[PDB]
Chain A
Amino acid sequence: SPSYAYHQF
């Protein structure tokens, strides 16, 4: 199952 990156650059 994929992981949402979430955190912003």
Chain B
Amino acid sequence: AVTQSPRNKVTVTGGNVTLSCRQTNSHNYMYWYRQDTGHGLRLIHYSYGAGNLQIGDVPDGYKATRTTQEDFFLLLELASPSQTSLYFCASSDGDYEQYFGPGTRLTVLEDLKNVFPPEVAVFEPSEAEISHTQKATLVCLATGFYPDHVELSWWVNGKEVHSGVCTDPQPLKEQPALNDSRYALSSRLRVSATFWQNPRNHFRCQVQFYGLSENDEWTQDRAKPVTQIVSAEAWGRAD
């Protein structure tokens, strides 16, 4: 198994960021990659054993440390906005198949006054749809959040569902003409009309948002845009 820590991280530019990778496969090689749309998966640094470090394809602004055979760390001593990315470590026995970790999503911000939590609204199934197709679609909208660093999940009767769900692959910019634009994201959850018309069924759209921490400074009189969960809900309607 290859584990990564943390799973999510938000920091202001110029700060220090450490990503941790562990590997219990007894493998010699370990790797640090970054993932960005338009470039694919690019190699940053790698290592064939404890104490060994070898430069990858895009190493500027990163150092790495292989303290043991299990542990490999990626260090960003002066984090910059271009290092916003999705980071994957991996292990390998020589040139055999690589095994990848779960990923660390990192956002590096130039200014924390741009951070806004999302607002979440659930939209109930149209009765013309319940009649015309005997099915019911709930739509969820997460609007006005910055940075683009959220996870949206549906919960029926208090447990998360995946069947009938589809979420937009990426958010859209509410103000595409601005480098500081906030984002919006839509999702849909479709059930049977019979399931929607039972008034004991509870539905909740949940948006996990990664923003500032308690340690970060905040002097605006807007509520502090901390990491948080914003949900919206709806009950089954008998008519």
On chain B, the residues within 8 Å of A6 by CB distance are: 94-95
- By a CB distance below 8 angstroms, the chain B residues around A8 are 28, 93-96
User: Which A residues between 1 and 9 are near B, CB-CB below 8 angstroms?
Assistant: 6-8
Residue tally, chain B, CB below 8 Å to A: 5
B86-106 contacts to A (CB < 8 Å): 93-96
Complex: A6 Cα to B92 Cα, angstroms:
13
Interface residues of B: mostly helix, strand, loop or mixed?
Answer: loop
> What CA separation (Å) do A8 and B94 show in the bound complex?
6
For the complex, what is the distance from the CA of A7 to the CA of B96, rounded to whole Å? 8
Q: Which of B173-208 contact A (CB under 8 A)?
A: none
* Chain B: minimal CB distance from A2 (Å): 16
Q: How far is the CA of A8 from the CA of B93 in the complex (A)?
A: 7
Contacts of A7 in B (CB 8 A): 94
Q: List 8 A-B contacts (CB under 8 A).
A: A6-B94, A6-B95, A7-B94, A8-B28, A8-B93, A8-B94, A8-B95, A8-B96
Please report A residues at the B interface, Cβ cutoff 8 Å: 6-8
